[PDB]
Ligand binder design. Sequence first.
Ligand code: SF4
Ligand code: SF4
Ligand code: F3S
Ligand code: F3S
Ligand code: FES
Ligand code: FES
Ligand SMILES: [Fe+3]
Ligand SMILES: [Fe+3]
Ligand code: NI
Ligand code: NI
Lengths: 634, 634
Amino acid sequence: RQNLKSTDRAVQQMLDKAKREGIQTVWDRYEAMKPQCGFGETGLCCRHCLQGPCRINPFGDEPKVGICGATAEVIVARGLDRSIAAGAAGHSGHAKHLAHTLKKAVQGKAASYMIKDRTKLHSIAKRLGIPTEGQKDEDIALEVAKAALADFHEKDTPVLWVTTVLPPSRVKVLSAHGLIPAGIDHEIAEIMHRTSMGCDADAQNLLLGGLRCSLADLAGCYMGTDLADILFGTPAPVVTESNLGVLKADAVNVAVHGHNPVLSDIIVSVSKEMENEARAAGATGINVVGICCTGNEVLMRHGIPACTHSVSQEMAMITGALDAMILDYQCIQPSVATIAECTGTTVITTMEMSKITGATHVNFAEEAAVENAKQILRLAIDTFKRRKGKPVEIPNIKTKVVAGFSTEAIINALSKLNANDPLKPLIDNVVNGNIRGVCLFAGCNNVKVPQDQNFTTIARKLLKQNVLVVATGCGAGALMRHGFMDPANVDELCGDGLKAVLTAIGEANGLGGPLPPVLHMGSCVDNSRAVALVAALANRLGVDLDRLPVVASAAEAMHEKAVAIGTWAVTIGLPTHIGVLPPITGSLPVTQILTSSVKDITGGYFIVELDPETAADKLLAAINERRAGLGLPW
Amino acid sequence: RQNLKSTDRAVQQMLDKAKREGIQTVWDRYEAMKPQCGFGETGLCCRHCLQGPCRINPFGDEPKVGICGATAEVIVARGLDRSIAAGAAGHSGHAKHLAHTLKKAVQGKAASYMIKDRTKLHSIAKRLGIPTEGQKDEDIALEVAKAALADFHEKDTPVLWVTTVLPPSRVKVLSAHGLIPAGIDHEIAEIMHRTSMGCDADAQNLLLGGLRCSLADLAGCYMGTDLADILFGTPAPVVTESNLGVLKADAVNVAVHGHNPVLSDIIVSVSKEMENEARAAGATGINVVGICCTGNEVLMRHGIPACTHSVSQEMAMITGALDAMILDYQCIQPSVATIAECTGTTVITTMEMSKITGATHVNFAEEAAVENAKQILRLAIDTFKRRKGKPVEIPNIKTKVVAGFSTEAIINALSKLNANDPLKPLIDNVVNGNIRGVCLFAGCNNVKVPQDQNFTTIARKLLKQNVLVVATGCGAGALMRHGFMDPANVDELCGDGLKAVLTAIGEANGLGGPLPPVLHMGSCVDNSRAVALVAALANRLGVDLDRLPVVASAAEAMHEKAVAIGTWAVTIGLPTHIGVLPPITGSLPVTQILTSSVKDITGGYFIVELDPETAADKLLAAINERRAGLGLPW
Ligand code: SF4
Ligand code: SF4
Ligand code: F3S
Ligand code: F3S
Ligand code: FES
Ligand code: FES
Ligand SMILES: [Fe+3]
Ligand SMILES: [Fe+3]
Ligand code: NI
Ligand code: NI
């Protein structure tokens, strides 16, 4: 039975435990929701004013139009635009938090934080045009943080975290269509305005606004990665493990869940100090483990093992060994606060704008990060003690994970084959066919799709066709939990050409073995790292991104953030697969813009395909079409 | 039949014409939508991620909770918060537009605009703390415009268009609850973040965020009024007319519809220049008439007659005499673009973010306002010529309207009774019972309510109980179209005490007659004028706004902007009636917060009441409770 819910064996085992214990899960709540509303599924519902709710029958007779006259086209486009703005609001709110934290750190107001990556700080300053010669690091960083904050509002320049991160030719194409954001929060607000009742009512105009707001989301992502690297270190290759078997019955198990490394990075460092305090309580130590993006952040930088991801997050609690779940914001099922009553887990919120009824709230202030962390960890230690003598059921299931492939690390790895032209070995192998193209897997799991089934099915076909696969967020989580980040699986998973390249790079890096089958490029904001890599390739080749054999797949998408990311992938020029239905099919004109005529605007386009084998074929076709456009064999 | 749709006779006549001509109206589209979705009506629907749509049965069995675990409380509060943010995005986008226009004007970049009200400019600068002594007006205005723009983002001060417009004691109460906005667009974005999936999931916390975002909406409203007064003149009493009978078969009839006086003010002035050009085309002249808020703006400042409002806007076109409908944004039924095919009206959009498929778009640039206006008006003249010899059906129905009661004008009128303490005559008459209290009517019509029936039913009962009634937006539109702004109706409509006061003020102003039964305080952003009046009363009395016998009624609310306004009315301390159901009844805890326990936070509260006689009784009870709290008879 449980295989229809998740393809992860550890998740299946915990689903069996939840069932016999009567603990309701996300899958049970989904079953209880069926059949879901077909107006909502197709996008043909509007609640943007108190004359509503309005709906439109996909087919048949009336209602055919909204009460104010809004057509199916308008309703669908307005709902989509609001989702893009909501995603932009999340990624950029994360980035804004980090910008204020950096400012505080270098103003002397938060001594738990510091410039850890001086090289990253100077390179960002150079990219932005901020002078470094003869300046103190703290002054350079103050200027970077102020520039970050300035990109949220209108000013004399557009959003620099768009215009300084894409090639000039791409910026020119976007500017010609009016798509460069003027300010991050400015664009979010303009979306909410133009989609309110009696405002924008032309599908093309609305969708152009959405594309521009998606670039505000990209700017937030890139800003988040940049600032987190300065504060916490740019990732480099690291070896760790994933899945529920990383929990340890004899340790205090603490999950960091949510998004921002401002919180999870301090938890990691403070946890090591309190080891002896944990031992006094009868534990071996504090075992910090990751869930969702903030787990990815500490996996990428510190090798903290990943417990689980996205849709299966409740299953970590069902083991009975999760003593604490420490939260900041985004992608946290609020069910965790009630499940904790039955599992014993202490669920702790820390951010003023993200509370859950029934969860313990411990305000976290960057100015008091270490002390606030100790208060939180001491709640976890008390919880470990309370479970003295209780059996736990930790599935003895884990994989080996090689990760930490920031763009800097990928360039460094390649530089071992060509020191002064590090991108050339990659391009050479694209040209000779050893690498067919590149595919970025991104985004969530979604309860509608058996967990991980689309990521793994698509990835397997692409890897066998010599596609270089990179991954972020819970797409990276899916692939790591299924062995795709273990170099021991290269022979099984990779075509001969891809294997040759991964082996050549690995052996040049002293590994006596290959790079892993899939390169983990980090959290969801770290989709911006894939942008940096692709933009660097484009610049080295002297072509725009919409000529490169690079595609993206949000194969099991869920969050509004994933819609925003998919939309900016299209906007920067990529064929972009989405493996769940976004609420667009109720308007053929809108679907045709997003899947076809946007090619004429940005060169990218959505590929909506729920069958993963077919999605892989379509992604391969998109890659091979790009190869043919460059005059390459395929 | 038509009386169930609208209580306005002119609207009824045009509904008969639309019916025999087969032209579908908002009322027909509403009928086609019935029965509307009960999940949406109650707030128990969520589409915030691609696992949805989710719904919760108001009563009965499953579904009882959203797929991610979101409760009814969370779902209802998140939807409400998004509506507040959308309203804030509209009012503040309007204000932002005006701030950029003022900046351009005084930088020499838009010579069609200028500082028209020097007195207002200096008083705003003084309120904000901007020095004026020894400064050029253009420099003072540059500083005001920059301060306006700065309130959209975080900075070293909170939003000054909140903190400098409410009494210190009210700011202190709000600050204690964390409710002062940090930046207008900042708060909009934070709402969209915290309401996205897996973020804020505590109803009280979510609603506190909503209250804070409503204050960002108030700041946008107040900023909009302030800047429009500087650019276009602070209103003073003016006499005009309203309803469809203000159209003239032998003139070029041009409706200004939407919101921003940056557009409608120029149309008014340029139209007078082109009179002879219109006469050459066989017209008597150009007859500019108003619809919705931008109509209110030019009615308040110039006495431009109001044609119609809100829900009945299509009926102006049905006359056959509306040659042009000139739009910027907000509250425009997009049906107008298709109805125009059948009526001959030229519908013209002018703003980049607000287009309607099938409508002619004429970009308007403040830098070219006069020329762009002439292009627009020449389309209208061509349209008049095309209807040579066609019969029109203009209902011969109009009322007399005295309006222009800005807060400055109200203070000036009262100063004729007490020159150096102008608020005292008003307070004296509250104390002696000649004025029972004050009621602000605000907001839209809504197709669910027979048009104007709640505004007029409630207003009549309050006026008979000696309540001083003020009105804005389409509440003012409803009341003007039913004679409530004609001083000749004071004897019929007003209790003896109110009549005595209106007569005493009018006779002291040289009128030989009373002020009108209802004081028109302007457009919906000009709800901020009512705030200025109430805050001035509070300061003169040394008490906070939640002790004053002042209430608000959004008696037929529709737009997200009306939800935002109602919410900030509650947040500043007022009992606030809403005469349509907002999507809250699916959560009793949320309803109880908004109608009861918020009293303990801000002193205000919502009164949700769809029966207008009962609503009037509840508003009177709220007024009389405030009187009793002040130790006054009632
Ligand atoms: S905006 Fe138009 S379509 Fe949407 S709920 Fe209001 S009347 Fe219906
Ligand atoms: S956010 Fe939760 S309640 Fe809303 S659609 Fe997604 S799963 Fe359903
Ligand atoms: S952290 Fe969230 S946005 Fe998707 S990628 Fe994972 S569920
Ligand atoms: S202009 Fe719009 S917000 Fe309501 S008050 Fe009139 S319908
Ligand atoms: S009618 Fe179901 S989503 Fe609105
Ligand atoms: S189920 Fe009808 S509004 Fe969503
Ligand atoms: Fe994430
Ligand atoms: Fe309005
Ligand atoms: Ni994500
Ligand atoms: Ni309004």
